[PDB]
Design a protein around this nucleic acid. Structure first.
Ligand SMILES: O=C(O)CNC(=O)C(=O)O
Ligand SMILES: [Mn+2]
Length: 265
DNA sequence: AGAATTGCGTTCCA
DNA sequence: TGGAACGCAATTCT
């Protein structure tokens, strides 16, 4: 039916934009049974034909992956928490606020160096699999795009070391604040069988590797990251919260913006 | 001084 | 319903 034709349509855009051939490409529907193991190109869709998930292996040049990896590991070494955020954030507040890390070495490296380059591949990704996602991100405040140097208002930095079951991505969850599907990039170095992203309700395991992109709705599909016994799993999650369009913005950090939010009452 | 706890606040779901 | 949770600390303990 229109199932086989939709894959050829998506592959046509992805191959010509990324300038690479995606062999063994598969496609399913959100109602049907998902693949137990995913190691190649993969798309899932709804009844309308919209893309709910897209996984494109090895889209980032190896030099770019190695360069960002060594810098990420160098910065994270001098950090305490295993998570980092650049751009804006609206968690536990009635407003959007500048992340604390943005002024730090991690947030400066992301916003000034990483994000401007990754934004190009995010642009490649969105123009192929989800046009109305990039159409939404460009309707946001100009300050968000300038602060994060990316279509996505905020970026998550996940540093997953071996035997760290305490990490937030190691626990099954849904990012229930996401308004748009997130774009996920991976770095570091880890095995094919570990550090995969599993969608629990669908019993689907996506074996991600440094250099790959993952695009899916973290707000609808429950997901979790598997443990690694060796290596170092570093992932970047480019997302957009519902509050990025609803909640106001005072161009400041969290606690400082709370004082401003009370004075503007 | 640590550490341990509490605080400000939003949103969810077993 | 009340703990838990992509923040981010100031207060209160040993
Ligand atoms: O890192 C991954 O593969 C998935 N990450 C998340 O679900 C997250 O950061 O919320
Ligand atoms: Mn998530």
């Amino acid at each position: 039916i229109n199932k086989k034709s939709l894959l050829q349509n998506l592959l046509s855009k992805c191959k010509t934009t990324f300038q690479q051939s995606f062999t063994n490409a598969n496609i399913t529907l959100k109602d049907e049974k998902w693949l137990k193991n995913v190691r190649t190109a993969y798309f899932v869709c709804d009844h309308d034909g919209s893309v709910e998930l897209a996984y494109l292996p090895n889209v980032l040049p190896k030099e770019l992956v190695e360069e960002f990896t060594e810098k990420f590991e160098s910065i994270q070494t001098g950090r305490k928490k295993d998570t980092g955020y650049s751009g804006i954030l609206d968690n536990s507040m009635p407003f959007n606020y500048v992340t604390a890390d943005l002024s730090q070495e991690l947030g400066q490296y992301l916003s000034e160096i990483v994000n401007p380059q990754i934004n190009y591949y995010i642009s490649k990704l969105l123009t192929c699999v989800s046009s109305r996602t990039i159409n939404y991100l460009v309707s946001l405040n100009d300050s968000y795009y300038a602060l994060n140097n990316c279509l996505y208002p905020s970026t998550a930095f996940n540093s997953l070391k071996p035997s760290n079951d305490g990490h937030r991505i190691r626990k099954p969850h849904k990012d229930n604040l996401d308004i748009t599907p997130s774009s996920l990039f991976y770095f570091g170095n880890f095995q094919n069988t570990e550090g995969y992203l599993e969608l629990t309700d669908k019993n689907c395991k996506v074996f991600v590797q440094p250099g790959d992109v993952l695009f899916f709705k973290g707000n609808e599909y429950k997901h979790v990251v598997a443990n690694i016994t060796s290596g170092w799993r570093i992932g970047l999650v480019y997302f957009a919260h519902k509050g990025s369009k609803t909640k106001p913005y005072y161009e400041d950090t969290q606690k400082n913006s709370l004082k401003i939010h009370k004075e503007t009452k």
